[PDB]
Design a binder for this molecule. Structure first.
Ligand SMILES: CC(=O)C1=C(O)N2[C@H](C1=O)[C@H]1c3c[nH]c4cccc(c34)C[C@H]1C2(C)C
Ligand SMILES: [K+]
Ligand SMILES: [Mg+2]
Ligand SMILES: [Mg+2]
Length: 992
């Protein structure tokens, strides 16, 4: 049964045919057990490691390299037995990189924590029900509770299901709804029906929600919904939903893979049509099996040349080195790709309570009476500092520090706050911070007494635990509280009856009252001025409320409590405490002492972080569960709104948002910076609209209610003081709760993005140069210039060192002054594609020309034969036109090691040209990045180690170039820098 909050307790009881006294029977439970099942949150199992590694191989471009792995394994299977050691190097190093990138991709995207497990912690193991088989209350598992059961709930217990309240056994019933509402303040509940079925969970005072706990009181009720039907069940339904979101860089590289896969297939057929016919007259060079061996060797080389192997390594290396840089700022990155996404975020959604505010209530202001003249009175306004429950602070009067031991009106004010309290302060030894005991509102008064220190009690040489209650224990030794008049909804106040201890015969009993200002001071017939007592004037009572109104409804917008006392209370025996309605009569003729305002203070660095995101073009939108008045008040402090700014169309509540038509809801998500009284389902609903607009959203909650908005967001952020559910649902956690890490992570995320796309183009320009080299030798007919074994060493070891160093390029000075980049922007531009194509064509001709140089230059090699070079496959000894030259020169390492040195040297040049896009190398010196110069030296010296170390040149088929051949490769490769510089000059000084 749903929407039972609109129906009376008798109607709901009549729906299940149950008697609230005897509850359900055993035969009716079994009938309800079948249809509604057991009451629990089902668990969502995660994908295992065997399934995640398979999805790495399902990519289209991975299947291309995997295809070349099997072809090279068959090509190495047909090789002669003498060369077998060097033959299997190709398929193994291909399979080596194939498996290496497979596990790196899984280790990168894997989320090791499950949010459903943290959500199932709120399900209580046991519950208390009334059933027909027992005359009294029974205790059973929460799994066996079915809708229609009559349950009893007491203080401290967790609510096993969603329950319609029937009878409240205590005076008032208080609940902690922070699960759904995100707010830690207790809520008063009743049994009366609530109209307006569209009302949110915050507006239903007759319902108990599963996972919440009871702050105080005792009551009973009937279970409307169990299992997934509850409100916590609506949370996990949005938790199990995962769209496999991918960061924009992963999204474009995923598309670039299918765009590259079509080219590799077309280039294979492009060489196949230029392939001389082996079915007609290839001089019968081989058998029918030997005809397809060249097409397989050229396709493997085309795949190894086009596919940028090692790219998953340099990307993952940049993410891990960026995650470590963020951990030093106390930001724990739970998803490696998510450090890049935070650079392009155009909007930041933030929960107010626990994130923008300290979640700990503190007294902001207080006042007492100063002087009374006629019907007009003057007040002394005081302010109290500190954002936390830590009993530290100093009271200021009119912008001057003052000690309150000399104000007798303040001493009695602190007397009321300590003496009438159900709460206490506590110091956590493990957490190292002061926690709260009981109500957070009453705890704010406890801190005030310690921070005021009216009696000048010595606080030095006192333990941190003893310091919590230190100033309260003194007042407890003074006055003895005999009993307490419980808080009741009618009078909106409470009181305590205390008698002095030390002034036994010189003093008499008194009664201290606190409550809502309207209901209290109307029962106050006097005003406390210092230690004296003056009658309450209608002109005085009008001036008193004039201040309390400006505190509640003003730009401050603080909660207020009127503090009054009864000097001559009624006698002990004359008070019968069973009926709660008599308490408003017992508290009367009070003397108004003072009033104390309180607020949940915003965090210190939040207001400064908002101004920085505003300069970066990043909006901030508060989505909270608190009231609209308090939220707008916080937004004016932190800078989201202006003090005089009109919030009319810029702020909405939960029901107001749902009431709008879908066309009106769209406009709100764009222009509205504040959303209050928001159900957890609406937190994800707001973020869902921002994603429909092609915006990159960042959601920072601390709460269980924030979990849907966190999981739905592309990059979520969690507070270290937040619940475990909010941590497992996000990609990032702030351990120190510093909000300035958000603006520091956006700066760290933009520097990575500019460097990532920089080496992405460097590695992608190196591949097009290797395709032109392998396509030109196949069209001309020259022997192989580059072996795919050599290309893998160039793609991984040679080009991986400067590519990783390109991630260390110094960021921009104004980088945080730029608006967020377009998430749909291409990786390459029109002029950038023409440039990488022009550069790739020069290196392709430089490596092919290097092999043609050794043959045609006739220094150390044979003389120049062009017809014999393209036709070299037709060379067999005793054939004319080959007279004078050896037929084995085509397999010599010299032409290949000539092209390999040209390829490596050019890649050291392109690595140097990758410092800045359009800037020159003279105005941007090469030493601006030290890691890049060191990467070139290591990569260049590794090109020597591959030649000289004994086993290496046999598998790679290379030899040293001695003295002279290096001068040919250095003069041919160096113009790459001059050629690229010209393409940068016309783009910088002319194109734009
Ligand atoms: C087994 C494994 O997980 C993988 C791989 O083994 N790889 C990458 C890859 O995902 C491939 C890839 C997919 N999309 C792109 C864009 C740009 C570059 C690459 C890729 C490199 C690819 C390869 C083969 C290195
Ligand atoms: K998420
Ligand atoms: Mg992969
Ligand atoms: Mg919160």
């Amino acid at each position: 049964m749903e929407n039972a909050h609109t129906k009376t307790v008798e109607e709901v009881l009549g729906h299940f045919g149950v008697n609230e006294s005897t509850g359900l029977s055993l035969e009716q439970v079994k009938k309800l057990k079948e249809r509604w099942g057991s009451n629990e949150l089902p668990a969502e199992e995660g994908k295992t490691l065997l399934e995640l590694v398979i999805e790495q191989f399902e990519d289209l471009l991975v299947r291309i390299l995997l295809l070349a792995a099997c072809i090279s394994f068959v090509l190495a299977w047909f090789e002669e037995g003498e060369e077998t050691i060097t033959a299997f190097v190709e398929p193994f190093v291909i399979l080596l990189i194939l498996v290496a990138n497979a596990i790196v991709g899984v280790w990168q995207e894997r989320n090791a924590e499950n949010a459903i497990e943290a959500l199932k912690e709120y399900e209580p193991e046991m519950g208390k029900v009334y059933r027909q088989d027992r005359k009294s209350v029974q205790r059973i598992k929460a799994k066996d509770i079915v809708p229609g059961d009559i349950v009893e709930i007491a203080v401290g217990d967790k609510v096993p299901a969603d329950i319609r309240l029937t009878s409240i056994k205590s005076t008032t019933l208080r609940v902690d709804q922070s699960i759904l509402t995100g707010e830690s303040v207790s809520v008063i509940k009743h049994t009366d029906p609530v109209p307006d079925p569209r009302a949110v969970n915050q507006d239903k005072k007759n319902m108990l929600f599963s996972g919440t706990n009871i702050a105080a009181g005792k009551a009973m009720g009937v279970v409307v919904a169990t299992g997934v039907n509850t409100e916590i069940g609506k949370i996990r339904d949005e938790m199990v939903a995962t769209e496999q979101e991918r960061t924009p860089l992963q999204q474009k590289l995923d598309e670039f893979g299918e765009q590259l896969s079509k080219v590799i297939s077309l280039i294979c057929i492009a060489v196949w049509i230029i392939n001389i016919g082996h079915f007609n007259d290839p001089v019968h060079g081989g058998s029918w099996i030997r005809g397809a061996i060249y097409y397989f060797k050229i396709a493997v080389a085309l795949a190894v040349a086009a596919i940028p192997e090692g790219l998953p390594a340099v990307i993952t290396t940049c993410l891990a080195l960026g995650t470590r840089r963020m951990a030093k700022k106390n930001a724990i990155v739970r998803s490696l790709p998510s450090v890049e996404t935070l650079g392009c975020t155009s909007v930041i959604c933030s929960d107010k309570t626990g994130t923008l505010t300290t979640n700990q209530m503190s007294v902001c202001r207080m006042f007492i009476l100063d002087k009374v003249e006629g019907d007009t009175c003057s007040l002394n306004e005081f302010t109290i500092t500190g954002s936390t429950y830590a009993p530290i602070g100093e009271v200021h009067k009119d912008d001057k520090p003052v000690k309150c031991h000399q104000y007798d009106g303040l001493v009695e004010l602190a007397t009321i706050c300590a003496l009438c309290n159900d709460s206490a302060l506590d110091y956590n030894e493990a957490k190292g911070v002061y926690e709260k005991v009981g109500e957070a509102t009453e705890t704010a008064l406890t801190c005030l007494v310690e921070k005021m220190n009216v009696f000048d009690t010595e606080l030095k040489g006192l333990s941190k635990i003893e310091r919590a209650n230190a100033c309260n224990s003194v007042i407890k030794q003074l006055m003895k509280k005999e009993f307490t008049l419980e808080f009741s909804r009618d009078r909106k106040s409470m009181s305590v009856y205390c008698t002095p201890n030390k002034p036994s015969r010189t003093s008499m009993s008194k009664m201290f009252v606190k409550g809502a200002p309207e209901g209290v001071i109307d029962r106050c017939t006097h005003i406390r001025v210092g230690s004296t007592k003056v009658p309450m004037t209608p002109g005085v009572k009008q001036k008193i409320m004039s201040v309390i109104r400006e505190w509640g409804s003003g730009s401050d917008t603080l909660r207020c409590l009127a503090l009054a006392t009864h000097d001559n209370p009624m006698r002990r025996e004359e008070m019968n405490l069973e009926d709660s309605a008599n308490f408003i009569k017992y508290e009367t003729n009070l003397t108004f002492v003072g009033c104390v305002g309180m607020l949940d203070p915003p965090r210190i660095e939040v207001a400064s972080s908002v101004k920085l995101c505003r300069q970066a073009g990043i909006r901030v939108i508060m989505i909270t569960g608190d009231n609209k008045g308090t939220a707008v008040a916080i937004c004016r402090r932190i800078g989201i709104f202006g003090q005089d700014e009109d919030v009319t169309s810029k702020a909405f509540t939960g029901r107001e948002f749902d009431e709008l038509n879908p066309s009106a809801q769209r406009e709100a998500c764009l222009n509205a910076r504040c959303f209050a009284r928001v159900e957890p389902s609406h937190k994800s609903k707001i973020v869902e609209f921002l994603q429909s607009f092609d915006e990159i959203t960042a959601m920072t909650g601390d709460g269980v209610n924030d979990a849907p908005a966190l999981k739905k967001s592309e990059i979520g952020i969690a507070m270290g003081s937040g619940t475990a559910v909010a941590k497992t649902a996000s990609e990032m956690v702030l351990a120190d709760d510093n909000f300035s890490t958000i603006v520091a992570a956006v700066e760290e995320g933009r520097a990575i993005y500019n460097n990532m796309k920089q080496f992405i183009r460097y590695l992608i320009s190196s591949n097009v140069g290797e395709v032109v080299c392998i396509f030109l030798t196949a069209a001309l007919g020259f022997p192989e210039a580059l072996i795919p074994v050599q290309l893998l060493w160039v793609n991984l070891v040679t080009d991986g060192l400067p590519a990783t160093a390109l991630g260390f390029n110094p960021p921009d000075l104004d980088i945080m002054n730029k608006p967020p980049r377009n998430p749909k922007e291409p990786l390459i531009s029109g002029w950038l594609f023409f440039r990488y194509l022009a550069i790739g064509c020069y290196v392709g001709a430089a490596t092919v020309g290097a092999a043609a140089w050794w043959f045609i230059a006739a220094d150390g090699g044979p003389r120049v034969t062009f017809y014999q070079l393209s036709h070299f496959l037709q060379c067999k000894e005793d054939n004319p036109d080959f007279e004078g030259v050896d037929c084995a020169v085509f397999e010599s390492p010299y032409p290949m090691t000539m092209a390999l040195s040209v390829l490596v040297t050019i890649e050291m040049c392109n690595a140097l040209n990758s410092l800045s896009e359009n800037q020159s190398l003279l105005r941007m010196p090469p030493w601006e990045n030290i890691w890049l110069v060191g990467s070139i030296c290591l990569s260049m010296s590794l090109h020597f180690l591959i030649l000289y170390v004994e086993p290496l040149p046999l598998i790679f088929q290379i030899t040293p170039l001695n003295l002279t051949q290096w001068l040919m490769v250095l003069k041919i490769s160096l113009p790459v820098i001059l050629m690229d510089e010209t393409l940068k000059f016309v783009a910088r000084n002319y194109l734009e």
